Subunit: 281 residues, 4 copies
Amino acid sequence: MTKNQALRAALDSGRLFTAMAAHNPLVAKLAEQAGFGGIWGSGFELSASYAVPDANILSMSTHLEMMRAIASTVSIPLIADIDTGFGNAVNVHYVVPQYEAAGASAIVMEDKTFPKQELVRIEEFQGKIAAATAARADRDFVVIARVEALIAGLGQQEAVRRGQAYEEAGADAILIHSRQKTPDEILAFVKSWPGKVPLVLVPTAYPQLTEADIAALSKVGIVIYGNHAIRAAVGAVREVFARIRRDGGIREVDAALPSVKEIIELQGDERMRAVEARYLK
Amino acid sequence: MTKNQALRAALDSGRLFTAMAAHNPLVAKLAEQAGFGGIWGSGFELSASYAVPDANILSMSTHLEMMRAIASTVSIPLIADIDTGFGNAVNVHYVVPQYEAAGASAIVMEDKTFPKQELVRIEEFQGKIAAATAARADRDFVVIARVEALIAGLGQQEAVRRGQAYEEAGADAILIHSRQKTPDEILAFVKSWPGKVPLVLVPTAYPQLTEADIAALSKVGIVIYGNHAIRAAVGAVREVFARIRRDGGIREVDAALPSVKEIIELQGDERMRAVEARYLK
Amino acid sequence: MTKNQALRAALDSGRLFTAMAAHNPLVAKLAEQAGFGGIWGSGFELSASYAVPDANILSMSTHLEMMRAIASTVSIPLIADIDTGFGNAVNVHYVVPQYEAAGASAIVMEDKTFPKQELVRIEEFQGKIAAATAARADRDFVVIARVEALIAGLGQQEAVRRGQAYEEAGADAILIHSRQKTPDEILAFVKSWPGKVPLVLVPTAYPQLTEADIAALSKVGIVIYGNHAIRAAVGAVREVFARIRRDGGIREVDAALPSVKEIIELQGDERMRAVEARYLK
Amino acid sequence: MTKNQALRAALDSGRLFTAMAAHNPLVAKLAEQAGFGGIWGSGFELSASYAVPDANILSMSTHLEMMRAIASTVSIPLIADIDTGFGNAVNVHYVVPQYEAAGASAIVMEDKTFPKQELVRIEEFQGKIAAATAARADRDFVVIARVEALIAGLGQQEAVRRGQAYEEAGADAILIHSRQKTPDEILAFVKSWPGKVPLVLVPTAYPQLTEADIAALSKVGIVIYGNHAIRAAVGAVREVFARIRRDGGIREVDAALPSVKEIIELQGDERMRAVEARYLK
Ligand SMILES: [Cl-]
Ligand SMILES: [Cl-]
Ligand SMILES: [Cl-]
Ligand SMILES: [Cl-]
Ligand code: NA
Ligand code: NA
Ligand code: NA
Ligand code: NA
């Protein structure tokens, strides 16, 4: 199975597909090794790893090359965060094929306007979604529409009307996001979702909602961990930099770290040893 | 003081300058906040963050743009790892000015051959060093020669002859590296080093050697922590990915992580709020 | 004089500054040698050289690196086309400093909306312009506001109100564009322009308007040749590809071409010979 | 037929395949329209378009992205110039797959050393060639070995021994180059070439040798026009910049140029009109 089929196969089969965030290939590799179904090429995480606000500051090609870098590193499907398409349907049409070519198996686009109506018009986004499905070469590539209506405070009625409108435009799945610190809003949506396609959750704000709780929701097809990679990294590097400057060295801290040999193994040293062995003459 | 002056000022003043590794701008920012004197734009760390062996696999422009990204993020000096210059003196001449323009305050180049004599000839490297000092625009930019003779097993006599030869070619500082798991080899070198310029240590293999032990060595001007950033990151992301897949969620793990608000603050949200406030009209 | 001063000096002095389009460094070099005052880092030309419509398809970093490439090649000032700022004032604030750092001496931004009101609101653009002038480090860097009102068909009254509004927001110069195949519209504007800053023309559609005719217009400070580089290139490569395939070889066509030695000289072979001579040891 | 099959099919079929140089996608597009069999992603041309000596100055990723840009623009096969592999067999192993992924249907690598033995050892290059054929995913991707022995002055005997050694290592075709201003050296080689694979010519120095003369040589499978694109461009831009500065305008020169509408058509405006028409809602 190609990555696109692996992904599509998970959606059609009914399992719950788990996707972990990743701001670089090594991190994506570790997620693969930890057993997630796929990687999340988060715009937030990458812009965070660059110390820049997540407001379309990072160049679009910066995200694209990172996606290329990751897809060529892992064997599991990659879902790319392309925000709002970098423009209108025209931009979407030229963009999507580049992501598909970088190796992503799906892309996520939201109906928010660019730049900071909080959202674009329904018919306008339907058009941006149709442009996406048309632009793709392999029918397996998944296109996920992201409804930001709840975040907007437009209401549940409008959120479902958008999700349904997007589904009719050709969206393969719907990512519905919620602000509330309680997963009441999200659940309410799931329960009333009438559309035929799978839903996507990014339960970052309501960490009380487990995979078991989401698996219980037949309508949710994918779960996405949106920013734990960068958070895990920040928390640990920060603490280790504090210990080094408090201890005035790395005599106490070295022991608690992965060894250098472990980093070389994650770099793909084995593959390199075979190459050197059979071709370096 | 410009970054180049800050660095040069530390070398002339006699303090011990501490440099921490960094594979991305956020990590570099955290090092700055932890109080290191400067950042180390490590080739090992970056190629590691890309899951590729550190054997000149990563494109030279990949390292260059990361250095540009970091220098524009931190206010402290950046020392760039340019390996062996990406070729000969000609390559060195065209390369150095690009690094200086990305914003690095120094570059580190080694006398190893490319690709895998383990080393290049003395006169050849002297020439690559002279080409570097000539190519630089601001005389403050620091050029550090890296003697790999100990690693080569050519001996102490040859290591000092190289370091001295490089110093006469114009090298501002000498990075001398050692394999031994004990800092016996390194110390021996320091003690017999007759050259007039400052020495650089990257005590990664002998973590028993503290900053106090190195400060005791009047001849060492800079200490470099070569790969603790990527190791700290790997160790923590790995553990958090294991917990999530063992717990089947992030209900237990979320509490132990830096919050999302903390990541937004590190992204430079404050600067962005002021901009939006005064210019978004 | 730094490039920024050279440019600013031309604006304050009253001469007419000529800027030629360029889609790559070699072409920019040739323009310098032909004697233009500066280079025009055209979005149209670059997207054209990439066979893509000029509708914000090319990545923003693609244009940025080309500008970096050109500024490091020529010694004359470079004016970068940044279209509409790649977003709103926030985007403008983060963007401008990158262009200034690539080496551009000025940037041109237009009040058209993104993506396809044909224009943004006056106060909104004023804000995008103020964000630009605030974001710049060297006060000499020039910020040029581009009024697209005539193109919009909003009228002369509105075009001058925008140009004046932009000037009060801090715009150093005003680029006013016209559709008409006759330079009647443009002239009318110039004559009625009351603002204190210099005007910019890109007389591409009305080629009957010479530099003498524009020099006659005391209010115009800069003349820009918008797309003759790419047109000159297309016309000649096309003809030479036709001759080769019609002649079944390059026996007839080789004579009419610049020699290979001439291309090596434009590559900077002389500088390379000196480097090899003094540092390749 | 995929591009790789189109190429391979030309080699097996016995026709003479013509390849034209190209330093950017538009130029490559024009070559396609002029009817060449394929494009030549020349390192010389690209480094020339950047005003830098062709001595491995341009970043490897700079060439790679240009190849990606071109392959996504044309429908005919692209042959990428990868020089000497950017290192040894290890570098070759990691590199080739990136070029294959950018979309190239073949790569050309030479047995010259890096950086400036003029050549590497026979067994060493055999190894670099075997590493290339092993690294490729689609068996159709073509690997072309480039023998620089004549240029080296090692002689004909040694040139054929290399070409044969490379063929046994798995090289699909042999590019043999000559200095002489007369095609005597080249012909001599062709006549004595005993190997089973097709030969490649880049008759740049002996323009008296037509496609008919080369078609007469049953052993030559591909003809490559190495630098006429950049030469054609330089000659015309130079002349047009001279006329503009001599005429003090573009009133005389505009008439002799391709129109702006013609450039928009080459940018793919038609495709964009359809997209805007069916998806911009
Ligand atoms: Cl990273
Ligand atoms: Cl990165
Ligand atoms: Cl070009
Ligand atoms: Cl280009
Ligand atoms: Na990153
Ligand atoms: Na990284
Ligand atoms: Na170009
Ligand atoms: Na080019």
